[PDB]
């Protein structure tokens, strides 16, 4: 849909209008999307539901030495957004991976939806103050 951001801004408006009316909607959004509307980071455990094999990759990075990978990785990942695939930077080491799993989960949640989210957040903050 070439206007999809506008529809996401409408539904963000509709969420904030439902909140304003004190009326319950049958929405059941992910914890990731609720965190984005709260301005909270996602957690790696959220990936378990969104991309189990990606959660498993991060869990193979956790509690294992990078030496178990047998090839190097860096803060860059191939991401499909809007059906275009592009390699995007995220900014590897024993110190960086702690952030990589956080940051890679940020990229995987928002990168493909960042513009829909920005429309939703404009619709939301239009009616319900962020703070």
UniProtKB/Swiss-Prot annotation:
Ranges in coiled-coil conformation: none
Tissue: Weakly expressed in heart, brain and placenta but not in other tissues. Expressed in a number of cell lines, predominantly in those from colorectal carcinomas.
PTM per Swiss-Prot/TrEMBL: Phosphorylated on tyrosine; phosphorylation is probably required for its ability to inhibit TP53 transactivation.
Compartment annotation: Cytoplasm; Nucleus; Mitochondrion
Disease: Intellectual developmental disorder, X-linked, syndromic, Turner type: An X-linked neurodevelopmental disorder with highly variable clinical manifestations. Common features consist of moderate to profound intellectual disability, delayed or absent speech, short stature with small hands and feet, and non-specific but recurrent dysmorphic facial features such as macrocephaly, microcephaly, a broad nasal tip, deep set eyes, epicanthic folds, short palpebral fissures and a short philtrum. Patients may manifest other features, such as hypotonia, seizures and delayed bone age.
Functional summary from the UniProt entry: E3 ubiquitin-protein ligase which mediates ubiquitination and subsequent proteasomal degradation of target proteins. Regulates apoptosis by catalyzing the polyubiquitination and degradation of MCL1. Mediates monoubiquitination of DNA polymerase beta (POLB) at 'Lys-41', 'Lys-61' and 'Lys-81', thereby playing a role in base-excision repair. Also ubiquitinates the p53/TP53 tumor suppressor and core histones including H1, H2A, H2B, H3 and H4. Ubiquitinates MFN2 to negatively regulate mitochondrial fusion in response to decreased stearoylation of TFRC.
UniProt similarity note: Belongs to the UPL family. TOM1/PTR1 subfamily.
Domain notes: The HECT domain mediates inhibition of the transcriptional activity of p53.
Record's subunit section: Interacts with isoform p14ARF of CDKN2A which strongly inhibits HUWE1 ubiquitin ligase activity. Interacts with MYCN, POLB and CDC6. Interacts with isoform 2 of PA2G4. Interacts with NR1D1. Interacts with AMBRA1. Interacts with HAPSTR1. Interacts with HAPSTR2. In hepatocytes, interacts with PAQR3; the interaction promotes PPARA poylubiquitination and STUB1-mediated degradation.
Protein name: E3 ubiquitin-protein ligase HUWE1
Lineage: Eukaryota, Metazoa, Chordata, Craniata, Vertebrata
Residue range from the parent sequence: 4100 to 4237 of 4374
């Amino acid at each position: 849909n070439p206007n999809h951001l506008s529809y996401f801004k409408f539904v963000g408006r509709i969420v904030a209008k439902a909140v304003y009316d004190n009326r319950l909607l049958e929405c059941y959004f992910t914890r990731s999307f609720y965190k984005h509307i709260l301005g909270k980071s996602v957690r790696y455990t959220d990936m378990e539901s969104e991309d189990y094999h990606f959660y498993q990759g991060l869990v193979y990075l956790l509690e294992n030495d990078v030496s178990t990978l047998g090839y190097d990785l860096t803060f860059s990942t191939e991401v499909q957004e809007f059906g275009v695939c592009e390699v995007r930077d995220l900014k590897v080491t024993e110190e960086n991976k702690k952030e990589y799993v956080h940051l890679v989960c940020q990229m995987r949640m928002t990168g493909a939806i960042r513009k829909q989210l920005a429309a939703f957040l404009e619709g939301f903050y239009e009616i319900i103050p962020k703070r």
